[PDB]
Amino acid sequence: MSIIGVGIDVAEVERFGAALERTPALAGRLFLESELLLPGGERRGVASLAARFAAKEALAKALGAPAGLLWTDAEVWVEAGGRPRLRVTGTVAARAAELGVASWHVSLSHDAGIASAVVIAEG
Amino acid sequence: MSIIGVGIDVAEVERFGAALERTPALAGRLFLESELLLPGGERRGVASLAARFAAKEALAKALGAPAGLLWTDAEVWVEAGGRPRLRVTGTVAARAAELGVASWHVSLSHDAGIASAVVIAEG
Amino acid sequence: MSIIGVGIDVAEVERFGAALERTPALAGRLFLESELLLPGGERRGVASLAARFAAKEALAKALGAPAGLLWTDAEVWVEAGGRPRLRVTGTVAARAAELGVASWHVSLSHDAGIASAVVIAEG
Ligand code: NA
């Protein structure tokens, strides 16, 4: 296997939060319902959502996309042991397929002020 | 040899510095003496410490963010020529063995306001 | 192919901005004209420029260059489709050859307050 693309995004949380206020609308366009909520039903706060949006931007960059994605065609989930994962369908899985990606590696991070993600696509 | 896990962490230096101030015992829970003490014996500055803790956090995420790992079981050192490295012992060395980790790649960085790191685990 | 080095850099945009305004000759030490200018001919804004500098700092780290690079021997450019790339010449190309680097992967990002980049070198 070989690296196909890498992506990084680092976002100020307060700014991301302000963007969600500006049309909401946005949240529904950015996130699947499953991304908004923990398995126990608790609602994610803004820093954690910012990290999930950063992962999607990082995936868009790893795929060489110029103007983002059909965001709902990408899904950040978390394995039982805690490792984040990306699931891609439709438009994003098509882009993935034409590049030859067989494997994503993703890491997410946040504190209250900064959220980040990195994605490595291999194939 | 293949990518097993990736980790990233990006932290506000001011926030890390606040946490260390809230709790004087925190520095010695996160760091070995070798990381805390500059040559000559002055305490390593907050920003440089923040980057090192970002590296241990990114290492944790590269290993799939598992239960039971002491921060002191990972050490950031700098080899001749300046590349950072990670020496792992005890709980962290056990987790890496178990995942079949053969080698690590790490980078870290800071300015006065923001510290960051990325870790790639290969096996 | 294996990973030879990794680099990350995350910068506060305002701090980078402040530095360039203290020493206005400095932009031309760090950046080629192609990096300073947008497709239309106007100077890139500070956040977008800080991402290109982050990418050079990340490249320097991936190459084990502790004192930084001869900056203008590295040029960040973007493929028609949207993927950023690093062209290296002179001292930087020479360093990559010394280390046996065969290919580079780069991603950069900014918002208004934070710029970042990650470089992976493989060979
Ligand atoms: Na030019």
UniProtKB/Swiss-Prot annotation, chains A, B, C:
Keyword field contains Coiled coil: no
InterPro entries, A to Z: 4-PPantetheinyl_Trfase_dom (IPR008278), 4-PPantetheinyl_Trfase_dom_sf (IPR037143), ACPS (IPR002582), Ppantetheine-prot_Trfase_dom (IPR004568)
Reactions that this protein is recorded to catalyse: apo-[ACP] + CoA = holo-[ACP] + adenosine 3',5'-bisphosphate + H(+)
GO terms under biological process: fatty acid biosynthetic process
Localization (cell): Cytoplasm
GO terms assigned for molecular function: holo-[acyl-carrier-protein] synthase activity; magnesium ion binding
Leading EC class: transferase
One CC-aspect GO term: cytoplasm
Domain of life: Bacteria
Keyword line: Cytoplasm, Fatty acid biosynthesis, Fatty acid metabolism, Lipid biosynthesis, Lipid metabolism, Magnesium, Metal-binding, Transferase
UniProt keyword annotation of Transcription regulation present: no
Cofactor names: Mg(2+)
Enzyme Commission identifier(s): 2.7.8.7
One Pfam family named in its UniProt record: ACPS
Predominant place of localization: cytoplasm
Residues given in the record as Mg(2+) binding sites: 9, 57
HAMAP family: AcpS
Function: Transfers the 4'-phosphopantetheine moiety from coenzyme A to a Ser of acyl-carrier-protein.
Similarity comment text for this entry: Belongs to the P-Pant transferase superfamily. AcpS family.
NCBIfam families with a match to the protein in the record: acpS, pantethn_trn, PRK00070.3-2
Name of the molecule in the record: Holo-[acyl-carrier-protein] synthase
Underlying gene: acpS
